[PDB]
UniProtKB/Swiss-Prot annotation, chains A, J:
Subcellular location per the Swiss-Prot or TrEMBL entry: Bacterial flagellum basal body
Family indicated by similarity: Belongs to the flagella basal body rod proteins family.
Native organism taxonomy: Bacteria, Pseudomonadati, Pseudomonadota, Gammaproteobacteria, Enterobacterales
Name listed for the protein in its UniProt record: Flagellar hook protein FlgE
Range covered out of full length: 2 to 51 of 403
Swiss-Prot record, chains B, E, H:
Subunit text: The basal body constitutes a major portion of the flagellar organelle and consists of four rings (L,P,S, and M) mounted on a central rod. The rod consists of about 26 subunits of FlgG in the distal portion, and FlgB, FlgC and FlgF are thought to build up the proximal portion of the rod with about 6 subunits each.
PROSITE patterns: FLAGELLA_BB_ROD
Similarity comment: family membership: Belongs to the flagella basal body rod proteins family.
Record's protein name: Flagellar basal-body rod protein FlgG
Lineage, top ranks: Bacteria, Pseudomonadati, Pseudomonadota, Gammaproteobacteria, Enterobacterales
Keywords annotated in UniProt: Bacterial flagellum
Pfam families cross-referenced by the UniProt entry: Flg_bb_rod, Flg_bbr_C, LlgE_F_G_D1
Curated annotation (Swiss-Prot), chain C:
Gene: flgF
Protein name stated in the entry: Flagellar basal-body rod protein FlgF
Origin: domain of life: Bacteria
Signal sequence segment: none
Localization annotation: Bacterial flagellum basal body
Subunit structure: The basal body constitutes a major portion of the flagellar organelle and consists of five rings (E,L,P,S, and M) mounted on a central rod. The rod consists of about 26 subunits of FlgG in the distal portion, and FlgB, FlgC and FlgF are thought to build up the proximal portion of the rod with about 6 subunits each.
Residues of the full protein shown: 152 to 201 of 251
From Swiss-Prot, chains D, I:
Source species: Salmonella typhimurium (strain LT2 / SGSC1412 / ATCC 700720)
Quaternary state and interactors: The basal body constitutes a major portion of the flagellar organelle and consists of four rings (L,P,S, and M) mounted on a central rod.
Origin: domain of life: Bacteria
Record-given protein name: Flagellar P-ring protein
Protein family: Belongs to the FlgI family.
Localization in the cell: Periplasm; Bacterial flagellum basal body
Shown chain mapped onto the complete sequence: 74 to 145 of 365
Known function: Assembles around the rod to form the L-ring and probably protects the motor/basal body from shearing forces during rotation.
Source species taxonomy: Bacteria, Pseudomonadati, Pseudomonadota, Gammaproteobacteria, Enterobacterales
Length: 50, 260, 50, 72, 260, 104, 104, 260, 72, 50
């Protein structure tokens, strides 16, 4: 149950990376913001992988 | 090697399963179209050392005999199918469901999975696909010379070409509904496949006999509630620690039994 | 082990000290008076337990 | 009842063989040979129950029943 | 070979049984509709030797003569049938009991079992079943295009279909009450069956002469009090210590007799 | 207990086993008198305080009464003849074997 | 026993686990490697479906562990050891009595 | 010497084997694609003495006669071939399996081994090798100045070159599946060789015939669950201690025999 | 009652065989042979209860009841 | 006390969600504000359930 939480921590870090990159480019001509999409990694149901 | 040790070795495993469910729910707090899990437990064997109700004398029965029990086992983790809060991404390609239906998507091997994630993209050939690159049914194609994509509340996908005042219909998006939504088998990547406990896939149009409504520019977020998961972590941690204390007490009893 | 079946029954007889006499080869045999009353061959006693 | 345990000790399944004599007429009697078929210790004083003796054409030509004589 | 050793062995076995019961109670903390168990012990026989009350002398009697006791033995484990604290899981199919009733299910064998856990699902055919797939009496059939399932306080299950302002009743959930609730035989899987010491199953409406009220969206958690379990674990460990010390002391005495 | 010769012995060793044809017998196989026959479909066997032997059958919320394990009481128990195989037989100084329902 | 293959939304039945029920369980012969063979004391092995005719249920993912109670065995070792030490002393006493007798 | 000594010696050896398996599982927590091991034990021989079922009397049988058993021995070691949790290493050269397939590599002897570890490197020649330098049959050679390597869900390996808008295909990563995955013979270095009990090597692409899907940038961690190992360590220690006590009891018995 | 345990020791289930003589008239008597059928030790002094003797056509041609004579 | 407190936590969360919904719909024509009603869940009369 450690890898499952580590994966969520990594996903939150990626989200915050995207948010910081968007903020840093607040005034940058021709910049289009980014958005991170997440999907679960269920193996065979009844158990999660992160 | 002793009964209480096995019982407390089942308690540990059940609480570890509960922690696994909680951690998996908290890790996917941001994935769109997510349904959180709930683990259910049930009692194990019950040794009938004294069967309840045995006829001790010829007229007196024994009430509630010596029924020493075994530990616990989890039946399953069930998906709590509720409507997640909708958000406004304002991307003509994001669609959200308002009812209890599913999108149908064709897997590369020829079979069909079902997803509630509405973040759709367009491939190089112009077909609507899931963000994982899986082509969504019914294969709605989008011309190269497209100016705006309009997906209505009934699932009709329309494309307005250049300099033309009337939209062009390029397909019709349909929703699949099941008798039991919980019984679907999750295969990851926000995809569920049909299982015999989920009945059969009933295809329906969005607004009729029970398919949900589609809103364009909206994304369905997860239904995971952070505070409840925090409280559940506290209770599961305490239960795990107490069961470990039971393990330790059994260990001490065995040690000072052997030492005499 | 299901094949286990009876084959034969050992002959077990009942005789006191006053009835038997040790022959020259160490095997006891019925004395004359005792043989005359109990017959030549001693009938198996169903009460004997080995 | 179909579901039950019968553990017999006085019954043996046997095969009966006989010779159909020339010009045999119904009502006459013939000798039969009785041979045990499975894990039976002896047939010392048994009695053969009603047994239909079939031919090669699987038709009943004789009916067998009597007391078995075992050498001893 | 010596009496004190048998007595101390019986004491050790009783304490191990108590620890097994404690471990079973602690292993089922997260189980819904679970009742904690408590074991009760009795002493075993009593050697007569000198009959008390006998004539000690022509005019006097022996007051409280010489009785030598054997060890101890567990009589029975009684459940504590008390309302476990409720919990809101916000699910239209989870049902909790406020009073003293039970749900009835049918085993595959055709017999009827009774469960208090209300975590219900729907199968592929639309019938309300438990987590183990057992069909809950009285067999409420949920139709294909259901929008919401409402279970009231008195056990009526209603389904609201699309475009109809009135809800369609599809069953009636009743509760079974027993004269002796602790006398049921627990088979595990959160299931209890009727024995001759548990009287007869009396069907009743949930709100009538003593069946409990059904709450939708609530689950009845276990009634296990954990601090009591920790204190009882301390007690059991110390008692096992003392009994093992009695065994060791008897071992030391027989050694001197061997040396003689 | 019924001896193979046909006479009755008496034992206090209560460790019993069910033989192929049900029937409760001692450790040596001698049938325990008078007989208690346990069926095959029994899920639990209970010998009560009074000696009523009841079994649980599947689907039957009630137990099936099988037999009574009555005991035998003598007047001078010390006069019994110990024949070996954990069995006592009645002797001149321990006569009158009185069968009784235990507790009575 | 159901097996799920890729593509099929319905599991395919493969086989049936039949439980063999005996009427006298303890009469089986332990042949070694966690196996029992039927004997004359445990005749008539009855094939049955699990859950019917008194047969047990099947739980997948769990294995039945040994039912050996540990404290009972340790107390029994204590009893056995001291008992072997009291019988050895009886042997020694008989030996000394014989030595004294045959010495004269 | 004495039967009990041999039996307890066998018990000690079995518990030492269990501890060896436990230590092997614990030492491989950080190993990628490692499967935990379990030991299976069986009864040793059984001295027959009295035949159970023999004819004690003309109409009675001998129920459950005197069978005296020997010690215990381990039957076999079985792996738990299940999906381990994935870890993101953010490396284009690391591949993880989502199903039940194996990578086929070539040993320097020319024979083929099978590994589930996905930590791959590129040698000086450009061939995709494992961490130990074995060439992962087949081929996947890599061009000189690659900018990025893309391995799809179905094993298609592509390279993006400079000034070319279309990726070029340089191989096809395939998976081998076996009838019995537990029958593969472990040789170390995370390598399994074929045996006669592991069926035959079925070569297939990722997504068809059951073979798993490949994820780029992820590694499959070991499936070892620590809490089970800790409880099993407690079990092993206490069982070893009991068996040592039995050996000591036999020693004291024999010593008392020697003194007389 | 249907659910009960009867453990008898003085009763044996037997098969009775006889010969229907030529020109047999109702009221006449014939000899019968009585053979035990399952795990019975002896038939020393038993009495055969009313037994209908069927033919091949499964019709009752005789009624059997008497005292058995066993050699000894 | 970990099930009686969780109930109060959830009730306060529901009240705060209702308040936030009222605030968010400050400018929404035809909107009606919402309020939450809470009731105790006593059992015996000596055992409160939240």
């Amino acid at each position: 149950s450690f890898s499952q939480a580590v994966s969520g921590l990594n996903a939150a870090a990626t989200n915050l990376d995207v948010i910081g990159n968007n903020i840093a480019n607040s005034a940058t001509y021709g910049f289009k913001s980014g958005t991170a999409s997440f999907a679960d990694m269920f193996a065979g149901s009844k158990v999660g992988l992160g | 090697m002793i009964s209480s040790l096995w019982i407390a070795k089942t308690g540990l495993d059940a609480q570890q399963t509960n922690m696994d469910v909680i951690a998996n729910n908290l890790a996917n707090v941001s994935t769109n179209g997510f349904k959180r899990q709930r683990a259910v437990f049930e009692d194990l064997l019950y040794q009938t050392i004294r069967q309840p109700g045995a006829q001790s004398s010829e007229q007196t029965t024994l009430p509630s005999g010596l029924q020493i029990g075994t530990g616990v086992r989890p039946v399953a983790t069930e998906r709590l199918h509720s409507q997640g809060n909708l958000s406004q991404t304002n991307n003509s390609k994001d669609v959200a469901i308002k009812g209890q239906g599913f999108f149908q998507v064709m897997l590369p091997d020829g079979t069909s999975a079902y997803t509630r994630d509405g973040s759709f993209q367009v491939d190089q050939n112009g077909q609507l696909v899931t963000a994982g690159g899986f082509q969504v049914q019914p294969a709605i194609t989008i011309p190269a010379n497209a100016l705006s994509i309009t997906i209505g509340r009934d699932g009709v996908v329309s494309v307005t070409q250049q300099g033309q005042a009337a939209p062009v219909q390029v397909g019709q998006l349909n929703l699949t509904t099941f008798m039991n939504d919980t019984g679907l088998e999750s295969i990851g990547e926000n995809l569920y496949i049909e299982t015999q406990s989920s009945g059969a896939p009933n295809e329906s149009t969005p607004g009729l006999n029970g398919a949900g409504l589609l809103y364009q520019g909206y994304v369905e977020t997860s239904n995971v509630n952070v505070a409840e998961e925090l409280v559940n972590m506290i209770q599961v941690q305490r239960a795990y620690e107490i069961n470990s204390k039971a393990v330790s007490t059994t260990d001490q009893m065995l040690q000072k039994l052997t030492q005499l | 082990p299901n094949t286990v079946a009876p084959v034969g029954r050992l002959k077990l007889v009942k005789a006191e000290g006053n009835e038997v006499q040790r022959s020259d080869d160490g095997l006891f045999r019925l004395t004359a008076e005792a043989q005359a009353e109990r017959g030549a061959v001693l009938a198996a006693d169903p009460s004997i337990r080995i | 009842p179909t579901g039950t345990n019968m553990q017999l000790k006085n019954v043996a399944a046997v095969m009966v063989t006989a010779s159909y004599p020339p010009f045999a007429r119904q009502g006459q009697t013939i000798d039969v040979v009785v041979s045990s078929m499975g894990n039976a210790k002896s047939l010392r004083g048994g009695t053969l129950l009603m047994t239909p003796l079939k031919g090669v054409d699987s038709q009943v030509y004789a009916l067998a029943q009597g007391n078995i004589l075992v050498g001893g």
